[PDB]
Amino acid sequence: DIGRSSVRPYLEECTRRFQEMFDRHVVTRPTKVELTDAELREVIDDCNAAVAPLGKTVSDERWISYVGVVLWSQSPRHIKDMEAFKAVCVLNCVTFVWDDMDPALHDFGLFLPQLRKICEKYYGPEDAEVAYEAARAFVTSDHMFRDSPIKAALCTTSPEQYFRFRVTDIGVDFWMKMSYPIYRHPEFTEHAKTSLAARMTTRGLTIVNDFYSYDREVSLGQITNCFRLCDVSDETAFKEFFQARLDDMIEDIECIKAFDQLTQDVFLDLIYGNFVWTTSN
Amino acid sequence: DIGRSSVRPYLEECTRRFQEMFDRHVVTRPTKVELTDAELREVIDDCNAAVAPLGKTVSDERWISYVGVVLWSQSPRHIKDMEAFKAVCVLNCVTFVWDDMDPALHDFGLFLPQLRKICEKYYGPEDAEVAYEAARAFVTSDHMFRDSPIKAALCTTSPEQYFRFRVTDIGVDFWMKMSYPIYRHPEFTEHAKTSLAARMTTRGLTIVNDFYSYDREVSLGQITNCFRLCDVSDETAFKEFFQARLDDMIEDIECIKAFDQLTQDVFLDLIYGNFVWTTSN
């Protein structure tokens, strides 16, 4: 009865264990990026304009809720380009809206030009092409894998196949390829473009997201959640699985520390900031 | 020490077991692409032109040896664009030369424009940008990771970290991104562009290449080889590791079969074709 299953009995304990892991392995607290009133207004206006052709209406409160992940998960101390930062705010929010839509209502002809428009506004010509390609590939993947036997096979076989799918599907490759111009750091730029950046950070983002979304997703019949690979109703089976996932996170974080200082800060702020945002309110 | 270690005692047995696995799981044997005399000449002249600014002279025999992997590992039944095919022949060969060079002699200023020239000659405008970016990212990764603590961390920690590095470093992401125009198949094009194609095929290509290159690489102090993660001098430890690598290959191939017919043909032709080429006289 997977649709009725729940990780609620482990909610507090898992939250505590995630935080303890971060404190032991990352140490540095993530800090939230503040936008001026004018910056937030510009982001919201661009969000509304991108989504208007689809006849979609979204409240300011919803935009602000969606943009939180960007505010908490970027790396404030390393920011050099706030135009690129605003682009990521806009692109994150509007693609989140796209992902939330009935796939029948997905109109690539109307939406793709809006993504292009955003990228051309905020990025230089080279970066605009990279960010747009990543956005395009992301939304196209989102569309392709609805009701796909490939999605079923990748998500039900093993944690290995599942995270391999989530590199794209959770949006982290897209995130890196739109976020590197924020930092203008040659090493990070290359790790983003090669997708090694996304590969290093996929598990830490996905494990946290999946834990806190499990109950809702399972009730909606969504299969893209690693905790569906264990019997959550069996306390000992869940605990062994959860520990294996913590072990995955730790191994990633410890390898992340081999990267240069700025790059590792960006990677760790992303994984840890995502956890803070997911868990807030 | 590891420098004097060898997988030579397992050479025959592992070759038979790789083949047995392919016979059980893939069945359809790969067939070689035959180039006309004029096609091969054009490819070789393009290789020579690209590499001439780097001071390198390479014989036809050497080029033909480098191009074999392309002839064996593409999917001849599905070829629609031979211009794109020739481009892959050229780009594969010239980037192998780059990889083979002393990194002090790398000259991005001289080499990158040659890579661009090749892409502009053989591909349409959009495809040329995608193929070029993948080539640029590949050769840049090659240069960046030469004496890198990141490479050391990823190659020595676990099979998971190692294969994550090889998605780029073995050149398969680059391969997929320059190869999709050969096939003109929208689903395959997307799997190439998201890198899911590379992620699905990395282990099958890397495990085979690593086994057959182990003795040479280890005597040269090169660390990019998954068999350095086990004690190859210990028969039972080697066999446990080798079986785990076969199981990785099998799981991938069985998941590859969930993709559409053409896509799976291309993926399996690549993995199996590479094995046939590697093992060839």
Domain ranges for chain B, please list them.
1-281
Q: What is the number of H-type helices and E-type strands within chain B?
A: 13, 0
Tell me the two tokens of residue A100. Answer: 């939330």
Long-range contacts of B66-69 (CB under 8 A, 24+ apart): B66/B92, B66/B93, B66/B96, B66/B97, B67/B40, B67/B43, B67/B92, B67/B93, B68/B277, B68/B280, B69/B273, B69/B274, B69/B277
Report helix angle B82-100 to B60-73, nearest 10.
Answer: 120
The CA angle B270-B130-B144, to the nearest 5 degrees, is 80
Chain A residue numbers with beta carbons less than 8 Å from the beta carbon of B202 are none
Solving technique = X-ray
C-alpha distance from B73 to closest chain A C-alpha (Å): 23
Nearest to B153 among A150, A154, A258 (CB): A258
Superfamily of domain B1-281, CATH level 4? Farnesyl Diphosphate Synthase (1.10.600.10)
Cα–Cα nearest to A265, from A75, A45, A20? A75
Q: Does B116 touch chain A (CB under 8 A)?
A: no
Give the separation between CA A113 and CA A121, rounded to whole angstroms. Answer: 12
Q: Which resolution, in Å, applies to this structure?
A: 1.8
Within 8 A by CB and 6+ apart from B43, the residues are: B35, B63, B67, B86, B89, B90, B93
User: What Å distances lie between residue B66 and B40, B96, B122, CA to CA?
Assistant: 12, 8, 19
C-alpha distance from B196 to closest chain A C-alpha (Å): 7
Give the separation between CA B276 and CA B281, rounded to whole angstroms. Answer: 10
Instruction: Output DSSP code: residue B211.
Output: H
Residue appearing with tokens 């809720």: A65
Report yes or no: B79 and B182 within 8 Å, Cβ to Cβ.
yes
C-alpha distance from B251 to closest chain A C-alpha (Å): 8
Burial class (CB in 10 A: 0-12, 13-18, 19+), B165: buried
Give the separation between CA B174 and CA B268, rounded to whole angstroms. Answer: 17
Q: How many CB atoms lie within 10 A of CB A56?
A: 15
- Residue B94 CA, chain-centre distance (Å), reads 13
Cα–Cα nearest to A83, from A126, A41, A119, A50? A119
Concatenate the DSSP letters of all residues of A42-91 into one string. HHHHHHHHHHGGGT----HHHHHHHHHHHHHHS-GGG---HHHHHHHHHH
Within 8 A by CB and 6+ apart from A51, the residues are: A58, A94, A97, A114
Chain B residue numbers with beta carbons less than 8 Å from the beta carbon of A149 are 258
Q: Which residues of B71-97 are buried (b: 16+ CB within 10 A; e: fewer)?
A: bbbbbbebeebeebbbbbbbbbbbbbb
Give the separation between CA A190 and CA A260, rounded to whole angstroms. Answer: 12
SS3 B56: coil
Backbone angle region of A55, left / alpha / beta, with phi > 0 → left and psi within -120 to 50 → alpha: left
Q: How many CB atoms lie within 10 A of CB B18?
A: 23
Instruction: Output DSSP code: residue B261.
Output: H
Give the separation between CA B81 and CA A144, rounded to whole angstroms. Answer: 25
Burial class (CB in 10 A: 0-12, 13-18, 19+), B54: middle
